[PDB]
Design a protein around this motif. Structure first.
Motif, PDB file in Angstrom:
ATOM      1  N   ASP A 138     -12.385  -6.138   6.403  1.00 58.63           N
ATOM      2  CA  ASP A 138     -11.623  -7.360   6.013  1.00 58.63           C
ATOM      3  C   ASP A 138     -12.571  -8.581   6.151  1.00 58.63           C
ATOM      4  O   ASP A 138     -12.425  -9.522   6.695  1.00 58.63           O
ATOM      5  CB  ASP A 138     -10.444  -7.808   6.801  1.00 58.63           C
ATOM      6  CG  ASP A 138      -9.052  -6.591   6.540  1.00 58.63           C
ATOM      7  OD1 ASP A 138      -8.745  -6.656   5.470  1.00 58.63           O
ATOM      8  OD2 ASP A 138      -9.031  -5.696   7.569  1.00 58.63           O
TER       9      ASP A 138
ATOM     10  N   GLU B  71      -6.820   5.245   9.494  1.00 59.92           N
ATOM     11  CA  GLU B  71      -7.047   4.384   8.402  1.00 59.92           C
ATOM     12  C   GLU B  71      -8.302   3.287   9.029  1.00 59.92           C
ATOM     13  O   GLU B  71      -8.141   2.854  10.223  1.00 59.92           O
ATOM     14  CB  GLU B  71      -5.788   3.417   8.226  1.00 59.92           C
ATOM     15  CG  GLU B  71      -6.155   2.220   7.248  1.00 59.92           C
ATOM     16  CD  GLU B  71      -4.858   1.389   7.542  1.00 59.92           C
ATOM     17  OE1 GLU B  71      -4.507   1.015   8.487  1.00 59.92           O
ATOM     18  OE2 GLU B  71      -4.203   1.252   6.500  1.00 59.92           O
TER      19      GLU B  71
ATOM     20  N   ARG C 145      -9.428  -0.267   2.445  1.00 59.18           N
ATOM     21  CA  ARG C 145      -8.773   0.641   3.362  1.00 59.18           C
ATOM     22  C   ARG C 145      -9.222   1.910   3.107  1.00 59.18           C
ATOM     23  O   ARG C 145      -9.205   2.335   1.689  1.00 59.18           O
ATOM     24  CB  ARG C 145      -7.517   0.475   3.367  1.00 59.18           C
ATOM     25  CG  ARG C 145      -6.698  -0.769   3.429  1.00 59.18           C
ATOM     26  CD  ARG C 145      -6.960  -1.298   4.999  1.00 59.18           C
ATOM     27  NE  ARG C 145      -6.285  -2.531   5.175  1.00 59.18           N
ATOM     28  CZ  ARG C 145      -7.084  -3.611   5.401  1.00 59.18           C
ATOM     29  NH1 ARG C 145      -8.199  -3.520   4.901  1.00 59.18           N
ATOM     30  NH2 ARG C 145      -6.349  -4.839   5.746  1.00 59.18           N
TER      31      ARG C 145
ATOM     32  N   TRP D  11       4.499   0.213   8.627  1.00 55.00           N
ATOM     33  CA  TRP D  11       4.213   1.289   7.854  1.00 55.00           C
ATOM     34  C   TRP D  11       5.626   2.007   8.253  1.00 55.00           C
ATOM     35  O   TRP D  11       6.329   2.214   9.223  1.00 55.00           O
ATOM     36  CB  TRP D  11       3.304   2.299   8.458  1.00 55.00           C
ATOM     37  CG  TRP D  11       1.864   1.698   8.145  1.00 55.00           C
ATOM     38  CD1 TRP D  11       1.090   1.121   8.744  1.00 55.00           C
ATOM     39  CD2 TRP D  11       1.208   2.042   6.657  1.00 55.00           C
ATOM     40  NE1 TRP D  11      -0.144   0.695   8.045  1.00 55.00           N
ATOM     41  CE2 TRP D  11      -0.102   1.443   6.820  1.00 55.00           C
ATOM     42  CE3 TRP D  11       1.704   2.613   5.712  1.00 55.00           C
ATOM     43  CZ2 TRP D  11      -1.006   1.397   5.847  1.00 55.00           C
ATOM     44  CZ3 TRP D  11       0.851   2.781   4.671  1.00 55.00           C
ATOM     45  CH2 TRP D  11      -0.584   2.082   4.614  1.00 55.00           C
TER      46      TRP D  11
ATOM     47  N   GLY E  20      -7.015   0.844  11.661  1.00 53.31           N
ATOM     48  CA  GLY E  20      -5.907  -0.039  11.220  1.00 53.31           C
ATOM     49  C   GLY E  20      -4.683   0.677  12.044  1.00 53.31           C
ATOM     50  O   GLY E  20      -4.856   1.809  12.337  1.00 53.31           O
ATOM     51  N   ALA E  21      -3.512   0.173  11.823  1.00 51.57           N
ATOM     52  CA  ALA E  21      -2.276   0.405  12.192  1.00 51.57           C
ATOM     53  C   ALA E  21      -1.702   1.673  11.624  1.00 51.57           C
ATOM     54  O   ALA E  21      -0.580   2.235  12.235  1.00 51.57           O
ATOM     55  CB  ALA E  21      -1.289  -0.559  12.036  1.00 51.57           C
ATOM     56  N   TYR E  22      -2.277   2.187  10.318  1.00 49.71           N
ATOM     57  CA  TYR E  22      -1.643   3.318   9.807  1.00 49.71           C
ATOM     58  C   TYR E  22      -1.725   4.506  10.877  1.00 49.71           C
ATOM     59  O   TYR E  22      -2.433   4.620  11.395  1.00 49.71           O
ATOM     60  CB  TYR E  22      -2.366   3.539   8.566  1.00 49.71           C
ATOM     61  CG  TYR E  22      -2.087   4.928   7.945  1.00 49.71           C
ATOM     62  CD1 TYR E  22      -1.157   4.999   6.831  1.00 49.71           C
ATOM     63  CD2 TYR E  22      -2.631   6.184   8.213  1.00 49.71           C
ATOM     64  CE1 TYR E  22      -0.800   6.204   6.211  1.00 49.71           C
ATOM     65  CE2 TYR E  22      -2.248   7.418   7.666  1.00 49.71           C
ATOM     66  CZ  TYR E  22      -1.170   7.371   6.713  1.00 49.71           C
ATOM     67  OH  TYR E  22      -0.718   8.426   6.139  1.00 49.71           O
TER      68      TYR E  22
ATOM     69  N   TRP F 196       3.244   0.528   3.219  1.00 46.66           N
ATOM     70  CA  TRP F 196       3.087  -0.836   3.791  1.00 46.66           C
ATOM     71  C   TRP F 196       3.443  -1.889   2.942  1.00 46.66           C
ATOM     72  O   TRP F 196       2.923  -1.912   1.806  1.00 46.66           O
ATOM     73  CB  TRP F 196       1.874  -0.924   4.283  1.00 46.66           C
ATOM     74  CG  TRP F 196       1.344  -2.384   4.854  1.00 46.66           C
ATOM     75  CD1 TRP F 196       0.978  -3.258   4.099  1.00 46.66           C
ATOM     76  CD2 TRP F 196       1.294  -2.593   6.168  1.00 46.66           C
ATOM     77  NE1 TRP F 196       0.790  -4.302   4.881  1.00 46.66           N
ATOM     78  CE2 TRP F 196       0.890  -3.993   6.234  1.00 46.66           C
ATOM     79  CE3 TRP F 196       1.736  -1.907   7.246  1.00 46.66           C
ATOM     80  CZ2 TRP F 196       0.885  -4.873   7.526  1.00 46.66           C
ATOM     81  CZ3 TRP F 196       1.753  -2.741   8.439  1.00 46.66           C
ATOM     82  CH2 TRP F 196       1.247  -4.014   8.405  1.00 46.66           C
TER      83      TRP F 196
ATOM     84  N   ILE G  32       0.809  -1.271   0.156  1.00 47.75           N
ATOM     85  CA  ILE G  32      -0.055  -0.078  -0.076  1.00 47.75           C
ATOM     86  C   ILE G  32       0.837   1.281  -0.094  1.00 47.75           C
ATOM     87  O   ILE G  32       1.931   1.244   0.858  1.00 47.75           O
ATOM     88  CB  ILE G  32      -0.992   0.117   1.098  1.00 47.75           C
ATOM     89  CG1 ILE G  32      -1.702  -1.084   1.485  1.00 47.75           C
ATOM     90  CG2 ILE G  32      -2.097   1.205   1.140  1.00 47.75           C
ATOM     91  CD1 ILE G  32      -2.277  -1.352   2.890  1.00 47.75           C
TER      92      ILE G  32
HETATM   93  O1  LIG Z   1      -5.262  -6.054   8.680  1.00 47.99           O
HETATM   94  C1  LIG Z   1      -5.361  -4.775   9.118  1.00 47.99           C
HETATM   95  C2  LIG Z   1      -3.874  -4.283   8.647  1.00 47.99           C
HETATM   96  O2  LIG Z   1      -2.924  -4.949   9.039  1.00 47.99           O
HETATM   97  O3  LIG Z   1      -3.786  -4.338   7.285  1.00 47.99           O
HETATM   98  C3  LIG Z   1      -2.712  -3.775   6.578  1.00 47.99           C
HETATM   99  C4  LIG Z   1      -2.688  -2.478   6.742  1.00 47.99           C
HETATM  100  O4  LIG Z   1      -3.574  -1.613   6.316  1.00 47.99           O
HETATM  101  C5  LIG Z   1      -2.506  -2.262   8.435  1.00 47.99           C
HETATM  102  O5  LIG Z   1      -2.217  -0.522   8.743  1.00 47.99           O
HETATM  103  C6  LIG Z   1      -3.577  -2.723   9.079  1.00 47.99           C
HETATM  104  O6  LIG Z   1      -3.464  -2.942  10.303  1.00 47.99           O
END
Ligand SMILES: OC[C@@]1(O)OC[C@@H](O)[C@@H](O)[C@@H]1O
Ligand SMILES: OC[C@@]1(O)OC[C@@H](O)[C@@H](O)[C@@H]1O
Ligand SMILES: OC[C@@]1(O)OC[C@@H](O)[C@@H](O)[C@@H]1O
Ligand SMILES: OC[C@@]1(O)OC[C@@H](O)[C@@H](O)[C@@H]1O
Ligand SMILES: OC[C@@]1(O)OC[C@@H](O)[C@@H](O)[C@@H]1O
Ligand SMILES: OC[C@@]1(O)OC[C@@H](O)[C@@H](O)[C@@H]1O
Lengths: 88, 88, 88
Positions: free
Chosen positions: B76, B72, B61, A35, B83-85, A30, A15
């Motif tokens: 899923d 983010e 996303r 990140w 999300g972790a972003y 990513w 990403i």
């Molecule tokens: O499954 C969720 C996740 O791992 O997916 C990939 C990225 O979008 C990350 O930021 C997010 O936390």
């Protein structure tokens, strides 16, 4: 506010998120392992992106706009450079 | 004005359009049988989106920005969560 | 500033870049042989796009927003027309 653009490729996926913030565009990446900040750093108040994956090569085009001027930035495996796009 | 972001998958196709309007982002959905309002509803003045379809699973996303903060949101297969972003 | 949206298809690739500038959206096209101005010209302060390539057919959806009104414009091989999308 800040403005973003996003693209992705493959099944991991990779990403890329571009953020235009205070007249500067930066890139967050990513590839399945956290990140991180990418190499892209160019002026811009607005950003869009498209990408296409061919074989082992990702091609990315980032359209960075300031005022009425849009610059295309190209990733073709070897760093970012300006592309031939003009708005006419 | 309001600001939108769009993604699509498959051959029907499915389309998702996110609209940031008056500080709120909502989602409109097309799966071949009419437009309807989706589950996504989160704060934001700006929105971008990317998605990737793997097997029977769509992954979406949505990058929602207010001021200098980007969140983010992840689809899923089981609802939207943060999300972790981070922008760093 | 001006605001853009971009999409691409195939391996050439074909690229379409939509620019909302001063309340009007126009389109620039690349099919491997130079940039040129496309047929799309509609009102809008903000633009997003998605496309999907099926067989020999590209389908493009451009979401053009003015104020709180978003119009979907559809390319399905035979010119641009308004689509059924509403924001509700
Ligand atoms: O499954 C969720 C996740 O791992 O997916 C990939 C990225 O979008 C990350 O930021 C997010 O936390
Ligand atoms: O480090 C990852 C990287 O090389 O991936 C391709 C582009 O997104 C670059 O800007 C970025 O630095
Ligand atoms: O290889 C770079 C390039 O030719 O790629 C296709 C288009 O993005 C052009 O504007 C650009 O100059
Ligand atoms: O109802 C369709 C739906 O589940 O499709 C996936 C996501 O776009 C969701 O927000 C949405 O509600
Ligand atoms: O001339 C190329 C063209 O037909 O390609 C499909 C659409 O992008 C049209 O607006 C455009 O004019
Ligand atoms: O063929 C046009 C159409 O049915 O395509 C799918 C969606 O974009 C609809 O809003 C649109 O009216």
């Amino acid at each position: 506010s800040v403005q973003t653009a996003a693209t992705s490729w493959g099944t991991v996926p990779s990403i890329r998120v571009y953020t235009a913030n205070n007249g500067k565009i930066t890139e967050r990446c990513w590839d399945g392992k956290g990140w991180y900040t990418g190499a892209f750093n160019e002026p811009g108040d607005n950003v869009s992106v498209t990408s296409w994956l061919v074989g082992s090569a990702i091609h990315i085009r980032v359209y960075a706009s300031t005022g009425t001027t849009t610059t295309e930035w190209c990733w073709d495996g070897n760093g970012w450079t300006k592309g031939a796009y003009t708005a006419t």
